[PDB]
Each structure stands twice: as structure tokens, then as C-alpha cells.
Symmetry: D2
């Protein structure tokens, strides 16, 4: 069971197109040191672009040389001098990840692109804003769509910051101390197209902060998307009926088709901890490992392989739900109430030159009046409001306009059409410098 425990091939199959490319460079490195002749350098170089399985192999690194060694045979044995598994593999992984995050950053970018573009489009819809899940203030639909953009926007700032910490080159760090044969790291950083070489042989080998940061990230992006899905499956309630799901991104409901059953917005929510799970593990796996490269570290692979395949895929379903998303407008506009407008009478007298406690006591007196009058806030008489405060005049009429209350929240970052337009710029622009 042990060797079938040491066995890395099942999960690490993916490093093929990375194992050959990382070698072709180190091939070019040794010859520059004069360890290989052009003629033989060009021998194992082609093989690694001339390159079934076998039971005796442990890892993908094996699978290759074990193959390389037939077609070439001679040169093959030497190809791998000075560069051990431990430095070979981190090169084999920084490389895959750095390609996979380029991908990851693009998918996430479309999600933010898809939301911001839609926000512009649905800008004028009204619906309610909740606090402790209870109707509090009329606020715009794009203002909701936008808070999931801005927050998803941060994730790509993060993932762009990690993109650069992954781009380091460790190759040539040997096993504990560096490369004995002297081969220059610089050539290895140019060919592999990485940002720069690493300034220490024991860290490049024993450290996996690059995967740790990536899992911190993922677990945070999901915390973000599991909230987007908590909001949506709640807005998708027969009770609420704000948004209706696409019958392609929705589960089969029969004999009672009124039950437009979610699922996509549930699978997105489950992953929150399945992604966090691996991070919660990868950090404990290395809680206090003594020295340079312990075997413990074989966990780096399976983990970034699962969390990245969950992420690249989920983000696509998330964009796939926001764009299809069909909203029931009337339902949303009928979801408002003058009870939320009560706080707005306080803001009126404030502009007419009155203090707040007082201003909001008049609102309180306006509530109690309709209560006992029985007929609500819209049903209140002008002279009546002139009783509560003479400051009250003809312009109280406009305070009963839900969209007026919304265009009352200005000053950059508010929910006025003006401010939503400003946000739709800032995110798009933020993305433009990404």
C-alpha cells in the first residue's frame, strides 16, 4: 500500500506539458555550462518534443525520462544531473499554476465584466434593501449587482498579486544547497519566461506559500460567491419571487411547475467549505516541519489541482447565472412600502432648516398619526403635516416617490442613478488597469 501511497501518477498526470518544457530549458542550461554538447544537447532536446504507461514508475517525472531514455538512451542518463526531484517538481508546479491563474484571472474578469455591463443595462429597476433580512430602504437593482462586482473585483487584484509571486524560478536549487555544477539560474529564468530567480535554495525547496496563498484566495472568492448564491436562492423564493432562474440553470420541478427549483446557486454555495477545506488542511499539513524538504509536502499537488478545477468551473456557472438571470420587475417594484419612506420625512425638514432628533420626532409623530388615522403615510393631509411641522409644504408629495428617495443617496458610492453610473466606470476602469 505504501508504494501505492508513494505513487504520484494518478493525480499528477497533468504535469506532462510542463515536465518536457522545464527540461528543454535546463537542457539549454547545462550545455551553456558546457555539461552537454550542442550535438547531444540537440539530441535530448528533440526527444523532449518527440516526447503509453508502465507500472514501475512513481511520478510523471519518471514516466518521461523512462521514455526519453529509450529513444535517446545515451545522452538521456546525463540530462538530469544536478537537478533533483525536489527542485524539478516545484518548477513543474509553479509553471502549471502560473498558466492556470492566467486562465483563472480571465474567467473571473468576465464575471465582473458580465455583471458591470448588465448593471448599466438594468440600472433603473427598484427593489428593496435588507438589513437583518427585513425590508428597510428602496435601493436600485444595479446597486446590488454592483456590490458583487466590486467585491469580486478585489479577488482579481489578489489573484493578480499571487500571479506574480508564483512567477518565481526555483530551478537550479538542487536539493538543499544550490546547483553544484554551476549552471546559471539566469538562463533558466529567461527561457522559462519567469519574473526572476529565487534568492535562497532552502526556501525554494521547502516552501509552498504559493499554493497557500492561492487557497487563501479561493476560499475567499467562494465566501464571496456563496453569498451571491445565498442572496439569489432567497430572491428566487416563491415567497419573494424577485428573480426567476433560467430553466437551464434550474432544476426539474413537476406537477407543480410553480416551483422553479434552484441548484446551480446551491452548488456554488456548497463549495465554500470544500474550497476552504483544502486551505484549512494545506496549512495544517505544514504546521511546523523541521527542515529543508520533508516528504510531508507531497500534498501540494492534489490540493491546488482540486481547488483550481473547482474554481475555474464554478466561476463559469456564476457568470452563467448572472447573464441568463430573468427578473420579475413588477414583483420587485411592488415590494416597496411607505413604511420605508418614513425615515425620509426626517431628511426633508433637515433641508428646510430643522435638527434631526426633532426632525425624526416629527416623522415619528407622522407615523403615529397615520397609525391612528388608520390611513397610511401616502394618505396624509397637507395641513395635517402642517400641524406636525409648518415647514412641511407642497413638496411632501415627492417624498412618496420611491425613486426620489433613491436619488436622495448621492455623494459618490450612493444608490442614485448618478452614483451607479460612477461605479460602473470605476470597476470597469479598475479592470482596465488589470
Amino acid at each position: 500500500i505504501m508504494e501505492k501511497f508513494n505513487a504520484s501518477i494518478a493525480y499528477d498526470r497533468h504535469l506532462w506539458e510542463v515536465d518536457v518544457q522545464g527540461s528543454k530549458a535546463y537542457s539549454r542550461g547545462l550545455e551553456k555550462a558546457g555539461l552537454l554538447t550542442k550535438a547531444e544537447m540537440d539530441q535530448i532536446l528533440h526527444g523532449l518534443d518527440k516526447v503509453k504507461l508502465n507500472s514501475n514508475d512513481e511520478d510523471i517525472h519518471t514516466a518521461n525520462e523512462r521514455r526519453l531514455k529509450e529513444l535517446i538512451g545515451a545522452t538521456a542518463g546525463k540530462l538530469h544531473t544536478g537537478r533533483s526531484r525536489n527542485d524539478q517538481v516545484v518548477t513543474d508546479l509553479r509553471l502549471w499554476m502560473r498558466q492556470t491563474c492566467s486562465t483563472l484571472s480571465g474567467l473571473l474578469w468576465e464575471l465582473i465584466r458580465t455583471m458591470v455591463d448588465r448593471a448599466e443595462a438594468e440600472r433603473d429597476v427598484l427593489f428593496p434593501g435588507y438589513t437583518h433580512l427585513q425590508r428597510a430602504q428602496p435601493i436600485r437593482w444595479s446597486h446590488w449587482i454592483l456590490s458583487h462586482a466590486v467585491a469580486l473585483t478585489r479577488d482579481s487584484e489578489r489573484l493578480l498579486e499571487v500571479r506574480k509571486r508564483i512567477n518565481v524560478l526555483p530551478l537550479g536549487s538542487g536539493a538543499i544547497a544550490g546547483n553544484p555544477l554551476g549552471v546559471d539560474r539566469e538562463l533558466l529564468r529567461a527561457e522559462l519566461n519567469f519574473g526572476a530567480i529565487t534568492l535562497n535554495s532552502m526556501d525554494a525547496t521547502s516552501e509552498r506559500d504559493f499554493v497557500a496563498e492561492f487557497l487563501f484566495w479561493r476560499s475567499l472568492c467562494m465566501t464571496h460567491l456563496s453569498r451571491m448564491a445565498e442572496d439569489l436562492i432567497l430572491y428566487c423564493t416563491k415567497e419573494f419571487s424577485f428573480v426567476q432562474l433560467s430553466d437551464a440553470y434550474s432544476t426539474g420541478s413537476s406537477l407543480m411547475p410553480q416551483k422553479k427549483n434552484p441548484d446551480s446557486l446551491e452548488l456554488i454555495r456548497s463549495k465554500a467549505g470544500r474550497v476552504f477545506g483544502r486551505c484549512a488542511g494545506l496549512l495544517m499539513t505544514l504546521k511546523g516541519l523541521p527542515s529543508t524538504y520533508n516528504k510531508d509536502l507531497q500534498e501540494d499537488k492534489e490540493a491546488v489541482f482540486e481547488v483550481s478545477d473547482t474554481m475555474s468551473a464554478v466561476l463559469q456557472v456564476a457568470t452563467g447565472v448572472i447573464s441568463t438571470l430573468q427578473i420579475h420587475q413588477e414583483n420587485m417594484g411592488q415590494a416597496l412600502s411607505p413604511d420605508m419612506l418614513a425615515t425620509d420625512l426626517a431628511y426633508y425638514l433637515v433641508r428646510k432648516g430643522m435638527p434631526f432628533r426633532q426632525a425624526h420626532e416629527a416623522s415619528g409623530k407622522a407615523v403615529f398619526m397615520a397609525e391612528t388615522k388608520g390611513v397610511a403615510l401616502n394618505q396624509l393631509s397637507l395641513q395635517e403635516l402642517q400641524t406636525i411641522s409648518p415647514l412641511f409644504s407642497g413638496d411632501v408629495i415627492c417624498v412618496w416617490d420611491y425613486r426620489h428617495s433613491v436619488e436622495q443617496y448621492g455623494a459618490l458610492g450612493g444608490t442614485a442613478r448618478s452614483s451607479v453610473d460612477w461605479q460602473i466606470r470605476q470597476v470597469r476602469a479598475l479592470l482596465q488597469a488589470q
Copy 2:
């Protein structure tokens, strides 16, 4: 119990000097909007620099206005129009944290400063390098000291990156939608000395990514320091006896003083998960919270308050152990062995124009020879090595020099004096651009 559950004062006492400063600005904001008169603006402004307890208060925000309201009384009621608890508090927290990370980044900087400076100083000491905890290669002491620098160096890059994400200004985001009275956010970002204002009212209110990133960070810095301490308490073993602890940073050992008992390097290791614990929680606490500002979020405080007080303090003990640290040199130099030098005979013939498998088979033949000769590698005759390979000549003598083997690992990032010197520059410089 509930209100004594709602009660925030016990832990949130610290926000005093932050609650008064965040107000003095918002005081200057409202008047600019014309909500306060200079004369009254200057009334509540002084009070908030003119400013015992009381049982009826819930939070530190209360404690202040409840105090402000006597001395001023009049103006006091209005002071707090438009800015609710939810936007008041995140301002009250971004602010504290941003001062505490300035602090945090300085402490961590000295730790890296203290190690790099020492590395330069002890550069020439030799000791062994372990793999799966077993003697593998002679490598320098500063080369160990340096791998904990480079790695701690990354943490300050992170913490500097968070330092900027915390520096955002949310004030003026009202409750769900923005500020109704229009007060300009810009003035609020200038006075509070923050980088810029936030581009959304619902995110500034419901989001705590700023504390989430900080806990991700801390848990990673400890993973780093709990390893430094795993290495040190192991090097501090009577069995190993590489380093001897300061009897100030070491625990009382009696009747057998030979037992120089560690503790500081144990308290540093325990925290790994006590720091990770809060992060593991803070992310679950908000696994999928429906909408804008739920009460759930009251967890943001106690958590960054504990993790930051653990971090600022531990880092000082860590610098406090590295600088005092007294090493038993002889013990370390006697900790080497020609068995580790066996792999170096393979690298000799390689330079004399021989292939590796062959070169390392000759080493293998050299091992077996001393084995059966009984007398080890240093005890091997020249013509004997001329038997294993005629390439072997007078210069085999120098291969038995531990420091020669170490100066064999060059090419940037290795453990040669040359490379350690290069690293001592790069970190110091990295820090110079921080």
C-alpha cells in the same frame, strides 16, 4: 444574557482614540454641506478633544456621544446625522487596524533586519543540512538564518499589500445606500488620511475582507515562525546541541542544569493554530450571509484584536531569540561527516570530463572500497582512487574539506560565501524598497 451578549464595551474599549478622530472629520464634513454652523461645528469639535463609564451603554460609540451630549448637549444630538453605526464602526476599525499594521510591519521588519545582519556576522560557521531529518550536506549557518529571512520577507510584502487595502474609506455609506444629506466623501478621505473612498455602499458595510486577509496573513506568518521554532527547539536538543538558548529566553532547569529548557520557542509554535483558529472561524462566520450588514458581523472586532495582539507580541520574542541566540560552534563543526562528502567525488570526475551515472558509480565504488577497507573516505589512497578512475588525482585531497564542498554550491542562491553575501544584499534591498 442577550444584552450582555449585545454588549461590545469589554473588548471594544480600544476604539476610543479612533472614535473621536473619525467624528471630528465627519463634523468637518457636515458643515461643509452646511449641516452645521462653524460656531456649533467648533462646539462639538472641541468636545471631541475635551473627550468614567456607565452601565446603560452598549458600545464605545455610545460611551462617547453619551458623554459628548452633556458638555455640549445642544449640537450633540445632530452630530450623528446620516452616519449610522454600521458605517461609523467600519471606519472605527479600518482606522485602528491601519495604525496597528504600520506597527506590525515595523516589528516584522526588525526581525528580518536582525536576522540578515547576524547572517553577515556568523557567515563562516558550518553545520549540517537535513532532509527527512537526516544528515545530508554540509551547509552554512547563515544559509539557515537566511531562509527564514527570505520567507519572513514575503510576509511583509503581504502585510504591506493589505496595509493598502485597509486604507480605504467607507464613511458616508450610511446604512444600505449612501449618505442622504449629500456630505462629500472626498473631504472624509482627505481628513482621515486614507488612500481613497470606496466605490459602493453595500460592500463597504457588509464586507470584512480587510480583516479576513489579515488573519490569512497572520496564520501564514506563524506557520513560518512555528517552523523556525520547530527547527530551534530541535537544534536545542541535548542530543543535537547546536544552539544554546539564552537563560532569559529559556526555562528553569534544576538539579540537572545540563537541561537548558526551551519555552519561548514553544510559545511561538503553539500560536500557529491559535492564530489560524480565528481565521478558520471568521471565514465560516460569514459563509453565506444574505444581505447588507447582518448582525452576524459583530465578530470582526474580538478577532482582529486577539490575532494582532498575539502577532505584535510574538514577533518581538522571535527577534528576541534570534539575537540573543548563542551557538555551540565546535559541536556544529563536529556534526559533519565524509559520508556526506561521498556525493562530491561524483562532481569531481564530472569536471574532469566524466558522465554522471558513471561518475556516481565510481563514488559508489569508492564507498564500497572504504567499507571493506574498513577505513573511511578520508583514509583512501591516491593510487586506490586511481584504480576506481585514473581521472582521480592530487586534487582529491581538497574534496575532503567541508568548506570546499560548501563553496561548490554557487550560481546565485547557493550556500557559497559568495552566494550568502549576495542574499544578504537582496533581502536588505528588498526591505529598502519597503
Copy 3:
């Protein structure tokens, strides 16, 4: 900072009434071995029932002997022979916990008692049952109240199982190997009223599984209560309006009192991860500690001290919400719909001797018929249903009774009045054997 890091008194104040009691026994132990004379045994025994602070002390164990040593002075020095801090403290903790779990098991018992009793009382209320948060089947209110009982019932089985694993006596395990002076463990297990003594000196000292299990438990009970609160704050939605919160267990809502704002059912949900946090830590804190009693372990205290004070308190607020809980019955009964009854026409023909696919295709044909007839399921004509299937007869009338559909789910464990009554017995009884 270090000693003010070693300092245990701030959090470990609570062990007073446990430190004196654990000693009085070990006093009785040593004399039985003949290490103390009755006369002097009775000297330090009284002191420890005759027993301000001081800065030079580290722990609560200190605080006591340092006090004991004045009043007695002589005998005092010897009192503590053979029993070191490491075995003294685990005794000091098994003891506190075992009293605190007795407490914990009682609070949780009342919560289950309070729910089951209420279930009996509100048995006949109808409301809907949701799947992916969408109206699916009419089911009883006590059937909801009962699923949180049964599940909370398991937690007390767990906590009762841990109650016994905590009840082990470690005292007398010295430091690494046992007690050198021979004092019998048996007497120490009788006096301290524990279940039995521990069969190993190195485990009793280094192991904290007793707190680890307790935190596993807590984190699971909250997962349970954070769900009860997710259900309730959702049922408390102005949109849903199933249950209305007590204005004592509810937060202040003004100018729009229609917004009966939750909080208690939010504080209960936040803790989910604040409780899980400590568990997520306590397990990482000891991920692979080498040998017998490392200092790392000082984490055992602060953690079970926070998680237990959160638990004993939350459970009271949870019982405090279920009992006050006021429900809007009409709202709940009007929350049903014949669309959910469609699946019940399939179960009718099934009893009249028809196969399901067919039976449920007739229901499907009945849906489409009302759809196109425009007039819903209750509005369907008898001969009409005799068209879809002649099996349909006069008894179709009763299928439109929501409570008939509910009394259709029998066979132990269903939601028929009969089954709810059966459950109200089983839980109560389960508790009776606890």
C-alpha cells in the same frame, strides 16, 4: 513580554475552587502513604479551606501555595511533593470541565424539554415544508419544532458520552513516569469522585482529547443551532411572516415598526464558526508534538474556557427564543397551495389500484387541464376527473384538504398527528434515560 506570555492568571482565575479541592485529596493521599502526619495533614487541609493577589505569581496553582505557605508555612513546603504542575493542572481542568458539562447537559436538556413540550401544544398548526427553499408540501409546525429536538437530542448523547471521558483521574502521574513516592491512585479517584484512574502516565500528561472532543461537540451543536436560527430569521421575514419575534428577544425598529428586527437569532448564528474556530485551532496546535508534555499545550485552558462560556450562554437564549416565540397562524395556513396537492392525486389512484408513472401522469394531465381551463385544481369537475381516470370519484373532494394530505404521511416518523405524537414520546423518553 515573555513572562507576561508565560503568565496564566488572567484567564485561569477560575480554577480556584478546583485547586483547593484537588489538593485536600492529594493531602489525604500522601498521609496514607505516610508522607504527612495526621496532625500536619490536618494542618494544610484546613488551610485549604482557610484558603488578594501578588505580581510574582504565574498561575493559579502558584497563587494558592504562595498563600498557603504563610498561614501554615512549615507543612506547606511538603504539601506538593511528587505531583508536578503538569499532572496538577490536568486534574485542575478535568475537574472544572466535568462540573461545567453537568451544567451544559442540563441547559441543553431544557432546550429539548422546552421544544418537545411546545410541539405537543402547537401540534395542529400547518405551514409549508421547503426543499431548495421553495414551497413543496404541507407539513405540521410541530414537525419542524421536533426535527430540532431530535437533532439537539443527539448532542446531549454526545455530551453525555464526553462527560464520562472527562471523568478520568490523572493525578499521581508525576511528570513523565508516575508518582515516585508510591501514593495510591485509588484513593485519589475515590476522593475526587471520578470514574477511574488513568492507565498510563505519559498519556494523562500530554493528552487533551477531553477538550478536543468537547470542542468537536460544541462546533456541532452550533452547526445545529445556527441552522435553527437560519430557519427562524427567514421565517421572521416581512416577506414570509410565519413567526414574529418577542420584542424582548428582538431589536429596536423605529419609524417603521413593521420591521420587527431579529438579533438574538443572529448572535446564535455567528458563533457557529467562533466555536468551530477554537476547535479548528486546538487540533492544529497539537498537530504533531514530539513527546510527553510540551509547553505548547498551555492552550487547553483559554479555549475550553471561551467555548464553554459561549455554549452555556447561547443555549439559554435559544430556549429563550423558542418559548417566547409567537406565531402568525393565519399567515402560515394561507401559505399553502393546491399546487403542492397535485402530487396527492397520484397517491389516490395508487390506492384505487393504479400504477405510479400512470397515476402521476394522470396528475400531470390534471395539472395541464386546470392550467388550460384556467381554473385551478380545487376548481376541477368530478366527471372531468372521471375523464382523466374513471377511478376518480367522490373522494377526490377530501384530497383538497391540506390536513388530509398531512395525515397521509404516517408509518412512524411521518408528519401525521399520530406520528408527531409518537415522536413527542420518543424524544422525551430518550431524555428520560439521560
Copy 4:
């Protein structure tokens, strides 16, 4: 991607032999209700023991009926009336797990059996006991072997306790409320050989405490085995050289075979968090799921499938390392020192009628004397000790016997041969009542 997200077959292949068996019973259930005729009951019964793949299927439940439906065709459609996926699957999982824990409890039992038996065998070996990783007291080797038994013994008490909570029968709980057709649960609990039926339809469906407890368990057993491996890889240090690994359970070391390189005892340590990871996730995945059976819950499978395959396998390698384990006795006996015996002179005068502080001050005076005499504790003259205390006499000679000091720790649970023999009984017996 969504459906290839909904797809369960890849991981859930294993439930075959469980899906057919759970049906054959429910087949026998419906007929007893009179829903199936013996003749047709015996039709789908054989098929489900008469029972390639297909792309249109989602789960293993599908794969079967989709197959069942050809060979039988007729009866097949009805086979699945009243029992939906949600209750079908938990039956499909309680069942697999309950078989897999029987297995799990046996493997773990052999590990405890293998250690206890060996302890008896190596009983007389001496080696040192460490505290903060520093030589403190001479203690027996079986006394180490035994502390990992007692602690592993608890895990099987746990796993035996979960074994019973898994043994519950949910089948017949329909979807939200129970079985509509009335089929008796009792028959379903007898045929499936489970302990009893569940007393609630909404809990059996939405709850996964059974997997949650199993992951709590696993993560704890590994915390235990990752410590056993931390101890062993440290005892396996060339520096320590207490135990030598089997060259079958050890990694290839060349050119320096003195480096007997561990691995098995590293793979065991890595899993600590890979096991904890899933638990840390599975609990967050359900942090506060609203109602009866949300789709979120599809996580129950992949998780208990990975954690159980890691556990059943690791435990075998752990038994596989303890039994092969070859110890270097001389090395261990030479690992002792009279410095550890210093504390034993204090225990001598104590028996000769002297108080401790005094007794241990004489030891202190004995240390200082040898220090300044230069010649250590064994080199101390009788009249010399008669100078420090006249109580000192001829029997001081035996205090310099390491095994005497070990046989000084009696009173049940100590490290005297007498006590180790007592422990070897208690564990074996504990296992006998398991």
C-alpha cells in the same frame, strides 16, 4: 459544466452493492403493504441480483434502475414509488459506512493489538523520557509503546460509538414528510439489519452528523498518529539513533547508506490536515442551511469516501512500522545520564524521614559538590554524602541504577515493570470488551 457538475457517478461508483441491497428490502416492504404482488415482487427482486454504463445517467441510483428497467421493464417503473433520491441515498450511505467502519474498527484494533503485544515483548528496554525535547528521566520503552496504545484505544471507543449512530435506518422518510403509501419502517429496519428506525423525517433527510462525527474522529486519530510519527522520525535521527527503520518501510539512501531515510513515518504525518481538511470543510459546507434537504449536501459522499480510504490505509502502514521496527538498544541505554538521577537523591532522604525542600536542597548540594569536585554523581564518596546528610548511607549505591529509578515509579500507571504489566492487561482487556 453544470450537469457535469450535477454528475455523481465518477466518485459514487462504490454504492453498487449497496444500492441493490437497499432496494431488495424496500421491495419486500411495498409488497407487505400490498403495493407489489409476490409474483412481481419476485420479479424485480431477482433482477436486483441479476443486476456497462451510459452517458445520460447522473448517479449510481440511476445506473441501476435504468438497467433494471430493461430486463424487467414492467414492474421496474413501480419499484421506486414513495422513496425519493434523498431518502434512498442516505440509506445508500449509512449502509456503506457502517460496513466500512466495521472494517475501520478492526484495522485500528490490530494496531493496538500489535503494540500491546510488542510492549510485553520489549518490556525491559530503557531509553529516555523527554519533556520540552530534553533528556529528563529514565523510562521504559514499552512505556512509550503503551502511551500510543492507550490513546489509540480511545479512538476505537469513539469509532465504536459512531458505529452505532450510523446504524440508524432513515429509509421510508420520503422527501420532507414520511412515506405516503404507509409501508412499515420496521420491516425496513429488520431486513437492512440496522439498529432501529429514525424518529423524524426531516432530520433523517437533511442531517449528515454521521459523517461529521466520522470526520471529527479521523482527524483526531491522525492527530494521534501524526504524533507517533513525529516521535519516530525524531527517534530515527542519525543524531538520536534510537530506532532504525525497516528498509522496506524506509526510503532509498545512497552513497551514504548511513542515512536510513524515513518516509512512511512522514506520509502518516502529512495526512493529519488532509483528514482534518475535509472535516474543516464538511462542517462549513452546512454552516446554516435553511430547510429540509438542500442540494448543498451532495458533499457527504466524496468526503467520507476520501477520509475513509486514507484512514483504512494509513492504519495499516502504522501497524506495519511498529511491528517491523528494529531498535538500537545499546544506543538507547547509553542515552541515559546521572544528571537525570539527581532528582532521585531527593526521593531517598524523603524515605529516610526528610522533608522535600530540604531533601532537594541536599541534592542541589550534591550537584554543586560533583560540579566543583569535577567528578560526577557516580563518582561521589560515601562520607561525602554523609557530609551533605548523615541520612545518606550504603544504599546510595543503588540510586545510580537507571532501572532502579524506573522501578521507583509504581502506584498503577507508573513505569515500573509492575505497572507496565498492569497496563498491558487493561488495554488488552478494554479491547476484550470491544
